[PDB]
């Protein structure tokens, strides 16, 4: 995963999720990708209402990319693995 300055281009399935969250560009930093992923999860209320570090991704397009039904914001490895599969480094 590249640093705070390196630019990335998301593959089409990930870009569609970012665009739902309001992204207007096609090139990002990793921290911008994470911003829009957070926006997406928040807008769609995928986080568990009571234990809000748990994200329930099943039956959502995000879960199809993550390949897991749920994950913890404190165990972000599935998210990082998804980003490695879905970001082209520029």
């Amino acid at each position: 995963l590249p640093g705070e300055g390196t630019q990335v281009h998301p593959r089409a399935p990930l870009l569609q999720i970012l665009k739902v969250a309001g992204a207007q560009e096609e090139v990002f930093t990793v921290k911008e990708v994470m911003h829009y992923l957070g926006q997406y999860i928040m807008m769609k209320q995928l986080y568990d209402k009571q234990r809000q570090h748990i994200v329930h991704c099943h039956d959502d397009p995000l879960g199809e990319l993550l390949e897991v039904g749920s994950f913890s914001v404190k165990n972000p490895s599935p998210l990082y693995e998804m980003l490695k599969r879905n970001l082209v480094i520029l």
Partner: peptide, 14 residues
């Protein structure tokens, strides 16, 4: 009692 927005921001900014 931490909100998702605060938890994700911590992840994002680290």
């Amino acid at each position: 009692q931490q909100t998702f927005x605060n938890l994700w921001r911590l992840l994002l900014q680290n």
